[PDB]
Amino acid sequence: DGLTPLQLAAKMGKAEILKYILSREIKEKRLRSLSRKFTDWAYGPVSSSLYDLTNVDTTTDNSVLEITVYNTNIDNRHEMLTLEPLHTLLHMKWKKFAKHMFFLSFCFYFFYNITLTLVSYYRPREEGRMFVLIWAMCISVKEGIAIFLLRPSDLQSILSDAWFHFVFFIQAVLVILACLVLAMALGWANMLYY
Amino acid sequence: ETVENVSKESERIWRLQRARTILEFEKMLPEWLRSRFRMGELCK
Amino acid sequence: LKKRIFAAVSEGCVEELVELLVELQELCRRRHDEDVPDFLMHKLTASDTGKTCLMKALLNINPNTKEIVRILLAFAEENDILGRFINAEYTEEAYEGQTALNIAIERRQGDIAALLIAAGADVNAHAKGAFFNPKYQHEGFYFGETPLALAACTNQPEIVQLLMEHEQTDITSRDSRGNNILHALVTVAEDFKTQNDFVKRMYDMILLRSGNWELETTRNNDGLTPLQLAAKMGKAEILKYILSREIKEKRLRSLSRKFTDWAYGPVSSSLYDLTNVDTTTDNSVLEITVYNTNIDNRHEMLTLEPLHTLLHMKWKKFAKHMFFLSFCFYFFYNITLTLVSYYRPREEGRMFVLIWAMCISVKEGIAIFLLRPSDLQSILSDAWFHFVFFIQAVLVILACLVLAMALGWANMLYYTRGLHDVLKFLFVYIVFLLGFGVALASLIDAVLELFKLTIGLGDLNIQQNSKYPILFLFLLITYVILTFVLLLNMLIALMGETVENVSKESERIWRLQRARTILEFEKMLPEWLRSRFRMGELCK
């Protein structure tokens, strides 16, 4: 299952070698064509480290992109698996990607998601809602099959869990299927987003 | 022992939990979208 | 030859450099259809970048490169090209004119810098580029060329002293965006994290060689005076030395602020002459500390920065002069009028009170333009009166229930001048109450009155409106679940770390918050009102 050393060591959450595998500042000559850290940018008080990395990072074969996200093991990784901050590991992508996509995922859209759920709940027959369920079913479709990654069964300790999985998986089926289950799905998802 | 858990419940766990969920956003785009070519970033 | 020299210089090879010299000698011997001081066939770069001669040894610092750089200059010395090579400057938006100055600045190469000016002191020239005329701080700093300042900017007075010892130094030239060498160290102020006295010695050493006050002669950009420029960014370390400057001995000390010649004795009367400027015309310390607007980890953690004349002088008298009567001699009517105005129903000194209220709305309404603020910034220093009174004047002149909210919000603020942790907490309950309420309370005007977690009304099952039998019975179990986390929510926050914040919430913050607001009183009077001529006050 991807016997590359970058992922194979990260598959089991091997912390000690993970720190050396990424932050590899090889020096001197006749070598250092390998490794990831290689600083030749004049240094100075203004440091511009050239963590060349190379290998593969967040493309095609899984190396560090989702291996840390979906280690699924105990994975007492770097910094007690606190996203393993090692140069390019967390200080690179999260310094920019957090404010690029994830920032608008829960903020630019959930304001309608929360309002629609309240509006949908506050819709009695007295005896953008359609667009909201478009992404909701997509997440149900996406994470519904994303469980097949590795061999997980349910919530595992407090390392990393996907609470959206259970609430939205029953959400889409029950709404299309009285129909009091729309409320429990609404609240359980509502707390998770916050 | 309520004081010990609360002071050590979010801590580093929130940083990994949020980053991993955000890291899944890279799986919803094709190879055309390319950012941060290489070499990492700069420091102090 | 040039490629051979570049390869030898880039790799630090010494013998290969001599081989390139022989090739260069042959080309010069042959008829080149030019003179000796020709273009040299672009020996360093063909109008591409810099890194000329010994500049390669700078970025390739090696034990062999020290002798090679000297040898290259030595060969260039007896070649009638030393001046041209020393004066070589780049022509790129990134590198332009740095020459051996910035090369010897980013790397602590004292001997290379020393021998650079010896062959030619062309490093004294300016520097412009991406890191020589930089921008938002991600590629360089504000050295403004000035190799004497660059060594000082590199926390190297020893190299800085040697350069300043030479003549022709542009110590009187601000250069670049415009700030002199004394103004330069403010850009390299830093904190005590990595330098406790490294930046202090440079400012003292330069002033020591600064015979006159010309060192503190700058008013470029936004008041480039060193008293305000250093205080603009809240540079604590230099702020303590800038004010409490007890210069002694002779042939000096005409500058500085502290100068005690009042017989001393057990009854101290310190003559903190200050001079310069203090609370008049140009902003020096009057409102700079009050409106730093930055993080400004200033003196005493920016606790109004008590440094002799800084706080012990004005606040010892001005607090009881004007601010004492501002909130006491008038607010007794302000509070009474607001209650009276609120207690004025149509049943279907008030005019004078709004005179100052609109004035504050007019005053602080435009006072926001000072620096570049947007809203409340952390807990350093805020103007709560701004929002409450700005809407107060407009809404009252514009039903009219907004007069009450303005009354209460201002009323609390005045007593405050005589909660961030809870602010996060109250949002959590409010967010959760909306979610939990929408889950079942709205599922089965508002009905959020059930949030009386402390006491109040009980449960009485769930019967408020449309109590027909529905699946809300199962939601009551979830209601217990919601109740369970609400109990844990307050328990975790209230009992978690409440003791630490309260013991360190007012502390020094009240001293700076009150003094800054009082310090604004000096801006409401003309130059006729003059107090505390100079010299500070006396001591024990």
Tokens of A31: 């070598």
Q: Is C297 exposed, middle or buried (0-12, 13-18, 19+ CB in 10 A)?
A: middle
CB pair distance less than 8 Å for A79 and B13 = no
CB pair distance less than 8 Å for A44 and C478 = no
**C232: how many CB neighbours lie within 10 A of its CB?**
22
Sequence-distant (≥ 6) Cβ neighbours of residue C368 within 8 angstroms: C386
**C76: how many CB neighbours lie within 10 A of its CB?**
19
Cα separation, C464 vs C472, in Å, equals 12
Helices (H), C233-383: 236-243, 299-302, 315-318, 324-328, 331-342, 350-367
Chains near A, with 3+ CB pairs < 8 A? B, C
Q: Taking a C-beta distance cutoff of 8 angstroms, is the pair C4, C19 a contact?
A: yes
Q: Taking a C-beta distance cutoff of 8 angstroms, is the pair A136, A172 a contact?
A: yes
Selecting from C138, C491, C495 the residue whose C-beta is nearest the C-beta of B42 gives: C138
Cα separation, C483 vs C371, in Å, equals 47
CB pair distance less than 8 Å for A117 and C432 = no
Q: Which of A155, A163, A162, A157 is nearest to A189 (CA)?
A: A163
Query: In a 3-state reduction of DSSP, which class is residue A11?
Result: helix
Cα separation, C204 vs C152, in Å, equals 11
Tokens of C391: 């809407």
- Report how far apart, in Å, the C-alpha atoms of A105 and of each of A56, A67, A109, A193, C423 are: 26, 22, 6, 10, 25
Q: Could you tell me which residues are beta bridge partners of residue C246?
A: C258
Chain C residues touching B42 at Cβ < 8 A: 138-139
Q: Which of C93, C62, C142, C185 is nearest to A46 (CA)?
A: C142
Q: Which residue of B has its CA nearest to C491?
A: B2
User: C-alpha angle C250/C251/C254, rounded to 5°?
Assistant: 90
CB pair distance less than 8 Å for B25 and A97 = yes
CA distance C130 to chain B (A): 15
Tokens of A29: 């000559």
Chains near C, with 3+ CB pairs < 8 A? A, B
Query: Is C456 flagged in the annotation as binding?
Result: yes
Q: Taking a C-beta distance cutoff of 8 angstroms, is the pair A118, C442 a contact?
A: yes
CB pair distance less than 8 Å for C141 and A45 = yes
Cα separation, A65 vs A77, in Å, equals 15
CB pair distance less than 8 Å for A160 and B17 = yes
Q: Which of A59, A66, A7 is nearest to B34 (CA)?
A: A59
Q: Which residue of A has its CA nearest to B34?
A: A59
Return the DSSP state at C319: I
User: C-alpha angle B25/B31/B35, rounded to 5°?
Assistant: 70
φ, ψ for residue C258 (rounded to 5)?
-90, 125
Chains near B, with 3+ CB pairs < 8 A? A, C
Q: Taking a C-beta distance cutoff of 8 angstroms, is the pair A52, A34 a contact?
A: no
Residues belonging to chain B with any Cβ–Cβ distance to chain C shorter than 8 Å: 2-3, 6-7, 42
* Mutation site for A-interface testing, chosen from B41, B42, B44 by largest number of A Cβ within 10 Å: B41
Q: Which of A18, A52, A34, A117 is nearest to C436 (CA)?
A: A117
Selecting from B12, B15, B38 the residue whose C-beta is nearest the C-beta of A53 gives: B38
Sequence-distant (≥ 6) Cβ neighbours of residue C432 within 8 angstroms: A191, A194, C482, C485, C486, C489
Q: Which helix (H) or strand (E) holds C217?
A: none
Q: What is the resolution of this structure in A?
A: 4.4
Q: Which helix (H) or strand (E) holds C377?
A: none
Cα separation, C127 vs C104, in Å, equals 14
Q: Taking a C-beta distance cutoff of 8 angstroms, is the pair C142, C179 a contact?
A: yes
Query: In a 3-state reduction of DSSP, which class is residue A96?
Result: helix
Q: Taking a C-beta distance cutoff of 8 angstroms, is the pair C516, C289 a contact?
A: yes
Handedness of CA C218, C220, C226, C228 (dihedral sign): positive
What experimental approach yielded this model?
Answer: cryo-EM
Q: What is the CA radius of gyration of chain A?
A: 22
Residues belonging to chain C with any Cβ–Cβ distance to chain B shorter than 8 Å: 138-139, 491-492, 495-497
Sequence-distant (≥ 6) Cβ neighbours of residue C470 within 8 angstroms: A180, C444
CB pair distance less than 8 Å for C141 and A184 = no
Q: Taking a C-beta distance cutoff of 8 angstroms, is the pair A41, A48 a contact?
A: yes
CB pair distance less than 8 Å for B43 and A54 = no
Q: Could you tell me which residues are beta bridge partners of residue A37?
A: A25, A51
CA distance A66 to chain C (A): 30
Chain B residues touching C425 at Cβ < 8 A: none
CB pair distance less than 8 Å for B40 and A59 = no
Return the DSSP state at C246: B
